[PDB]
Symmetry: D2
């Protein structure tokens, strides 16, 4: 009944965030409570110098603890997740994702870096003890037609996202 | 209702196999179809020369097709899964694990190679399109009291196996 | 002064092998000891059942011992190196690549799996203690004009092979 | 003749930085010019919001371009490099490490995460086009006796660092 959507892009507007926006609306439609976070919710110095007393982190940690699921989105930066997202994940307590379903989403400039999700991001989410990690959705930039005014995807990206979200919603029932 | 267990060790008796035998004892007490396979059930020339016509391969793929879950165990060889296991995995169809929940297990000579499960094995299981990959269990060789005569594990390893199997069991029901 | 080239494809003729044949043509014009091996040079039962007494294994290990560099090529299977190649790699001694410079090459059905080289193959070569691992070359199947009758590559792939081999050549001299 | 040492830890004093300090002194002794950077050299907001016009980044980019080699150190955070270090690496231009020798160093709370170097950090350094990546040195925290007042390591850590640094220095000669 409660889901956190987390945007890992440092820019605004963000292509990977449009996937999260589409996800939010589907989940709202199914009467799931969705709480959206992004890196602007945190003081940069708190993130970079890994300062655990951050008030926003406290709120975020508390909200995560109460969430049944997490949807996390990232750009591919240098064949991995964004450093910006990792600075926040690094501040989460050990076992932060224990008992939780996790759906990872990424967008990349080249399809050449599709494996960044499986080989880089999933291992960090598992280190946080995610109970289940879903297959995820990678899309290269050309598959997101609009991320500035209204999330618009090619039909194949939209179908893969629909499939992922259905699987995630079914998972939230245990 | 149906589960495949797959041992990936080239040798026998095997530590990683004794892990699967323990899983089966726990599932045999729950009215389940458990189908067990090892690398011995296939011809070495079929596996090394990637022969798709292989008769055991056909049997295995059909059984896998109708199964709802997979538990697969490997030794850690050169900081990854065994080459032997991978020759079989390479022969499965592109989407062989689609819609199935997967539980990876491994044994390793040193705790220093614990991450072989998250960074090497899981991306291959994801390439096969696993719907959900569970956290899994790594056991280092210090934890296997006996694997020749029957599974005997130190208490820390048993609790972790027990926990993973509960999750696997619960995950199978949807 | 001495180099091992190692083909990791279970099949022949092979795309990834045609890459190694091109390397050898370039090194044959530089007064070099080049020693070439493939998975056919070993018995399938030895490799699948991890037999350390293997007679070809012994020959290979000695030759590898005195060699200054290694060029190894693999197809991409299930988002990683071939299982077939890995069965041989699993049989080498713990520090087999110590003090040697290594050049990894791969071929893949899609550019989407380019990262299999950095995330899957290189950590195994590092487990074998390679002194230096070079950047390497991934070639997708679109770039191999012919591999049956002789190596024929699109110009983009040839320039990249040429560059990697220059680095490998230069690296061998210390 | 010019080397950049880069500290990826967000804290001060840093255990992984003591390795870099030991490296600096060895290299100074061999009349190499060593330029040390850490994350405090950058405004946090420039790092987090990936702002390429950062004056410090300009200076850092220019110094890196002129360097023959790079030594980069990181703590293991969540089974990978630090996010803080990744935010800086993310701001480097494509091909930033082309033509350069790279020695990666890491310290981790548990030996269980030794593979974080091979499987997480090296692929990012390769994405930046490093010409050669050395084996590297991982050490769990217990091997660094002092990082507050004077870098002091166990004899085995000190020997592995000496070996790595010799290899790096030899490499700087091409
Ligand atoms: C600093 C930076 C580094 C990037 N590195 C990569 C890369 O290594 N591989 C890739 O496929 N795309 C790379 N890109 C492109 C982004 O992944 C891509 O444009 C993405 O959709 C941006 O998502 P966002 O708008 O949510 O930030 C990079 C972009 C930036 C700004
Ligand atoms: C494969 C690829 C890799 C990239 N790597 C970087 C990078 O490393 N650093 C950077 O500033 N931009 C990088 N870019 C550029 C960004 O993607 C840039 O923000 C984008 O091209 C501008 O278009 P956009 O705003 O619509 O995403 C990369 C782009 C691609 C396609
Ligand atoms: C060829 C070979 C290579 C191995 N390499 C590693 C290794 O890289 N890392 C590790 O932790 N253990 C390594 N080991 C130890 C095995 O992973 C360990 O003994 C494991 O329990 C074997 O399980 P099994 O009995 O099911 O074969 C290796 C063992 C063999 C036989
Ligand atoms: C069993 C098998 C599995 C494969 N899986 C992948 C894959 O996961 N990703 C990919 O890019 N290509 C995959 N391919 C395509 C091969 O990587 C590609 O055709 C390669 O060039 C084979 O090289 P070879 O001729 O040396 O065997 C696969 C091919 C086979 C035969
Ligand atoms: C936020 C945070 C996360 C950490 N996560 C891990 C971890 O996943 N694995 C590990 O082995 N150590 C972990 N550690 C311990 C550090 O890797 C270790 O103490 C390291 O030596 C610190 O290096 P530094 O002093 O250079 O920052 C973590 C430490 C912190 C502060
Ligand atoms: C394996 C391991 C994992 C750790 N993971 C975290 C973490 O995720 N978050 C955190 O704040 N601290 C983590 N720590 C604690 C830090 O390492 C902490 O800074 C340290 O225990 C304090 O001692 P030190 O300052 O001498 O390194 C971890 C420690 C270890 C040993």
């Amino acid at each position: 009944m409660r889901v956190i959507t987390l945007a890992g892009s440092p820019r605004f507007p963000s292509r990977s965030s449009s996937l999260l926006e589409y996800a939010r609306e589907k989940l709202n439609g199914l009467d799931v409570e969705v709480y959206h976070w992004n890196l602007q919710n945190f003081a940069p110095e708190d993130l970079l110098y890994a300062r655990f007393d951050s008030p926003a982190l406290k709120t975020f940690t508390e909200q995560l603890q109460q969430a049944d699921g997490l949807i996390v989105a990232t750009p591919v930066y240098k064949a991995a997740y964004s450093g910006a997202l990792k600075t926040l994940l690094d501040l989460l307590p050990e076992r932060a994702l224990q008992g939780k379903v996790v759906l990872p989403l990424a967008t990349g400039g080249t399809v050449a870096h599709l494996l960044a999700v499986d080989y880089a991001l999933k291992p960090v989410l598992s280190a946080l003890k995610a109970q289940e990690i879903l297959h995820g959705v990678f899309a290269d930039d050309s598959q997101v037609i609009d991320y500035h005014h209204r999330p618009q995807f090619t039909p194949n990206l939209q179908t893969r996202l629909d499939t992922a979200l259905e699987t995630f919603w079914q998972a939230l029932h245990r």
